[PDB]
Amino acid sequence: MRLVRVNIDNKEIFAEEGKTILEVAHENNIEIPHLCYDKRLKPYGACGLCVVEIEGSPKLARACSTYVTDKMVIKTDSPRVRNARKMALELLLSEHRGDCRPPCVLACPAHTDCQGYV
Amino acid sequence: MRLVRVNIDNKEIFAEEGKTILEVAHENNIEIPHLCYDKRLKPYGACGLCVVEIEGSPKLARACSTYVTDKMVIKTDSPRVRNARKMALELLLSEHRGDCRPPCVLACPAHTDCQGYVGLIANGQFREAVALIKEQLPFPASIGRVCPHPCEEACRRNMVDQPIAIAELKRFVGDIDLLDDGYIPPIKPKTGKKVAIVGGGPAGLTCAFFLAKEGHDIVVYEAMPKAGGMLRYGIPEYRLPKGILDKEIELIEKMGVQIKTNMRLGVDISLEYLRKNYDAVFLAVGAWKSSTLGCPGDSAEGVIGGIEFLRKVSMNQPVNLGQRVLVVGGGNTAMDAARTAIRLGAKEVTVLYRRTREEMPAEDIEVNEAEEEGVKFQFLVAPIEVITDGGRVRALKCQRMRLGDMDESGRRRPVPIEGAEVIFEADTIISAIGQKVRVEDVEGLELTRHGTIKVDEGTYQTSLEGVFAGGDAVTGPKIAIEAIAQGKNAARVIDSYLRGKLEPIKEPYYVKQEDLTPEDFKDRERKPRVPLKVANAEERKNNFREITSTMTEKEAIAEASRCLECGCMDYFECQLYKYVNQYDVDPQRLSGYKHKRYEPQKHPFIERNPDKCILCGLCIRVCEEVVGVCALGFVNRGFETIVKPEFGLPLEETSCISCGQCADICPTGACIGKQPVAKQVPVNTVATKTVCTFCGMGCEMLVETKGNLIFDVSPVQSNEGMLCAFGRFGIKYVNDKDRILAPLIKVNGELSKTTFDQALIETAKKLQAIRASYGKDSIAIIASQRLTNEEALLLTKLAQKLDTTVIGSFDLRESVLDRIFGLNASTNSFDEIYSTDLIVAVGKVAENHAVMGAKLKKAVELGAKLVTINNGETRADERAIATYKIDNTAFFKATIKALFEMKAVDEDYVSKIAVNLDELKDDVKNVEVTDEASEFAKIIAGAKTAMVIVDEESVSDTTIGQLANILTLTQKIGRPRCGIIKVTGLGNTQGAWDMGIRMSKEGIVKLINEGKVKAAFIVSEDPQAADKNLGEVLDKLECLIVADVFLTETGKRADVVLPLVSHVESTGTVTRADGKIQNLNLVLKPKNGLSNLDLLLKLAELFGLQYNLEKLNREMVELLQNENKYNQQILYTEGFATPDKTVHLFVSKDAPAFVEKAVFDTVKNRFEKYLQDKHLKY
Amino acid sequence: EYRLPKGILDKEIELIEKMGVQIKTNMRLGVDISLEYLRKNYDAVFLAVGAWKSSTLGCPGDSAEGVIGGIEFLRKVSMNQPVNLGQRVLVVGGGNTAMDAARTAIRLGAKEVTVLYR
């Protein structure tokens, strides 16, 4: 078929027209964070973790809803993108209540999974 | 994406919009025939084989050009489609002239690849010849000793002088194999099935062989003390020694076949037990009951059957042979009995035959040998009575007869003559008029009218279910190769039955040439056949020693070289043969006028046969669309259409660059690439992927080998799927007979062969003596840039241990990119070429690297803009928007000045990223801006992205510096699709530079001429051949150590010569011109047992260095990481490699833009000289 | 090497190793291993260290650059290590070491080798 040419993280990729940046990067083993995406569902654009830097666009684009076009240059780990993802994650952690690990595991110097084996 | 839904052959498929039916079916493993299709080319629609039935379309649609739409229903094997494909194939076969298989193979009952193993013998591949014989015949030596060889009667060399000694060559290779451990084919994993063969003769042992090849558990039941059948008990020792038979039966037993001798069916074991405890039963009991004289008195004391007598003699059991022996019959049994009786001391042996001499069933050579040994013959007589005196034979009353009229035979029936009767005195009569299947062997089975087992043809199954039969038990007495053919076919059918899918044997369709007559071979040189050594009759008639001798290796090769190679060279890859065998074609109905336009050609690499052309156009389309040379075309029109080079000229005289793409794309052997071997032979090869080492493009290839010889090279299907003349045809040096395999050291002033240890010790001592007597940096290590990264790194470590920094290459170009950007490397990758806005190709980019020319053609077709800068014409000028013919660097300087005049240089950014900007402005301020320079500057400034492709083997370093300046000024470096790519002149130029081999020819020669360097260790370079002025420079050296694949002119003046192996015998890593690292995989084991890395590692262990391939690879990866050049498709994305991380702009005086230099690599220089001698281009 | 090739020596040492003897090379006594450890963990200890220290010239200036012991020089040549051997070599002595050093210096490219004996 007709193939678009993209540059994701300094790697030249020949993708197929009609895919999103998330799908193209998944195919080429490039990790882009995402929390509200699902291949069975229409895009939602809520979490804001999949933002990538596209050369020529002043605003970061959601990789889950942006489609790859011909002669595209994409950065997925630039300092702007990392800062945006860190800010989104901090906002998410602000409204979070939980124990990732129980206090018993954290009090063990060797971090033995006390809860797990109990 | 959006997916279309299709139904191809009742299977629902979710495909992608924009694909054709061919691609969708290929992805879903659905086979649609195609002959004129290629993924790199636009559709052509000529062959009409890919037609499919689409529901809703009354007309069949070509799958190669029809696109899949939503809710489509496609049939690819409906009767309409099959009929259309069969008709197209029959039409294609109507034009075809060729031999799919040679007449020798078709005349063999077992269809042994006579041509294949004869050609392998002519190439010295005796083990491969035996392995190829054993695909159809498990007993080469035995059968080659005793075979009437109809293949030689059908041989086409009969039309020239004398047929090939096919049987003798088979005997030769069989004996060679039996010298050492014999060849055993690979055995499939155990299948859990059990087959019982009754009878260890040729047919039973063949069935056991070919069923043990399939993994089944085989038990053979033999009534005799030993296996072998009539090969042991019928054929006498002087014609087939039993040691060879024993060795071959041991070979069969070594495959897991268990032979239970002295186990007769119906006495020791029953058929019903075999049916109960075995999955299949094969019966190969032969015809072991002899025919009686059929006259009164044929039961006296002194009458014996021919095969019973021969079996008694074979077992060394006593025989009451008198002094007057009458052998009745005219077959092989009669001749063997008569000659054995002669050798057993009988004073008179007479052979009585019913018919005439000129129609004897026996071979003429056997009858002639019997006549020489003293056997007498009587013809046209038949026995009517046996005169017995006291119960013992006294004489035989025979009826004289005459050839009366026709018969069921059809030739002539012998009938009695009345009144004529003759009495022959005889102490013994041997009845040898034929053998019949024993009734007791075939108990419980339905037989024919001759007593043989009745089987269904094609399946070999008897009346009983699960019980098969073959051989002399089924067909009656024949020759042994017929029994072997029956056993092999029965093994195939039995394997199918064990899989539960009983299939009869299907005869393939072969294209043949029945119109050939001797005048078609009148131009061939006549060569005598190998003479057959025959023991003297007088001495041989007294003993049971072998009569004939095996030929010698010289005679074997000379005899195999006589073959005319009648079979098609494309048989194992022809798509037309495969398709006409997939569809039941009857091409004799559409048979008429057929062209015969084939003419022999002198081209060393490509052979074209118009008579095998299906006019798919693929060769033309690939030369025009992919290569871009466009050397082929259509000539004439209609039925007269032919494919010809330009103006019908020979391929050498056209613009052809000998890339071989036409021969690689051809479906039906009308365009083939010649094998780099001594004699052409169509063989089934094994392909290994490796990397071409002849330039920096790093094209991958599949080397197809058979044994220790390379037979073909195929490009991989990656990008343009192209190789050039080098990568496709220069691998011929691997098979060269002039390769040195043992080291040479100078004794008595001349180079003589020695051992590796002695040569390496001599090398180490010579280098150490030079270092001692002359000090530091007195030894130069000049290495070829085709070595792997590990070998280059090890050579740098060897220079470190030898206390010398003078390590470089004579092919090494002066470096300027490390002074400007920091690393002497390409900035971007090859893939980005397809996506850049503008391409600037400098130098002979397409000429020196044809695949890069194809890549530029593809990139311009994809939407790029091409600018070519060169001093002469190039093939890339066709699609260039701007073509500049310059001879001086000033053209770039003016360009730079022009770039400043149009305010196209953002000096604010350049001042932060680059230094020497004011010096650059001062340097270019006084130059004159030309119209060409201003137009180039306009093109450069108007492009968003730009990549400069530079041919570093035809471009000076000043040009590269100025192009780097232009790229830096316009901010076209360190970004995707913007940069500079240097296509290096050899395979691992970049890797050699990275590993520390960074000295040029000029520096090394300057050191030698100043007396500072006194010894040279030269690794696979040819300074003496590639240059005439260096012969004086090499005169200043006191010690010369040369490592090379060939003994060259520079190696003939060396003190020590160390052999090197080819790159297909080496494993390692090579760095592409764009910086990518690829793996050199091992295709062939090294021919002297030592790889290049192994030899260098022995020389290193002589110096106290401990390394291996893995340690050197780890060091290489560390080195690349330390330079920030590891796994980086784009360089200087963060900053440049200069100490201040800034661009050091190139300021220098004007210099010539392009250079012409020789190739110092030995192999590439040799191949270039070979191409020049044959007047070829590349 | 021209008087005793080292392949023969290697073969004979391999023969000795094939008899159950284990050879721990690069294990110097007093540096890598101690005598007391040998006494502790072995029933018997045999010392066959040889005489591996050469005799100096015993004259003023015998520590300059260009003076080397005979066996040190021969060990350097045997190990294929660089030796700063000029063009005028003076071998002092008259024993086995003197003759071997003189002939090795001849084979190493020295244009003048002289042997001085008391």
Ligand SMILES: Cc1cc2nc3c(=O)[nH]c(=O)nc-3n(C[C@H](O)[C@H](O)[C@H](O)COP(=O)(O)OP(=O)(O)OC[C@H]3O[C@@H](n4cnc5c(N)ncnc54)[C@H](O)[C@@H]3O)c2cc1C
């Ligand atoms: C005298 C003579 C000379 C020949 N010369 C030539 C020649 O020069 N060139 C040539 O090409 N061919 C020659 N042939 C032909 C060739 O030898 C036979 O065609 C070939 O051996 C056929 O093999 P087969 O397996 O069909 O039968 P055979 O090998 O005859 O029989 C196979 C085995 O079955 C065994 N057997 C029989 N009955 C039983 C039973 N009840 N239970 C168990 N095992 C049993 C037998 O012992 C024998 O070992 C010759 C044959 C003869 C007799």
Ligand code: SF4
């Ligand atoms: S080109 Fe193909 S079909 Fe024609 S003779 Fe050769 S193998 Fe047979």
Ligand code: SF4
């Ligand atoms: S010349 Fe060679 S290929 Fe042709 S029939 Fe004879 S053996 Fe076969």
Ligand code: SF4
């Ligand atoms: S087995 Fe006989 S017929 Fe077959 S190739 Fe060999 S010699 Fe020819």
Ligand code: SF4
């Ligand atoms: S070898 Fe290459 S250039 Fe020559 S005709 Fe064939 S495809 Fe064209």
Ligand code: SF4
């Ligand atoms: S020679 Fe060319 S046109 Fe003819 S079959 Fe081969 S590829 Fe097709």
Ligand code: SF4
């Ligand atoms: S272009 Fe270079 S790498 Fe490719 S096949 Fe030709 S010589 Fe080999």
Ligand code: FES
């Ligand atoms: S995955 Fe959540 S915004 Fe894209």
Ligand code: FES
């Ligand atoms: S017509 Fe489609 S492959 Fe030939």
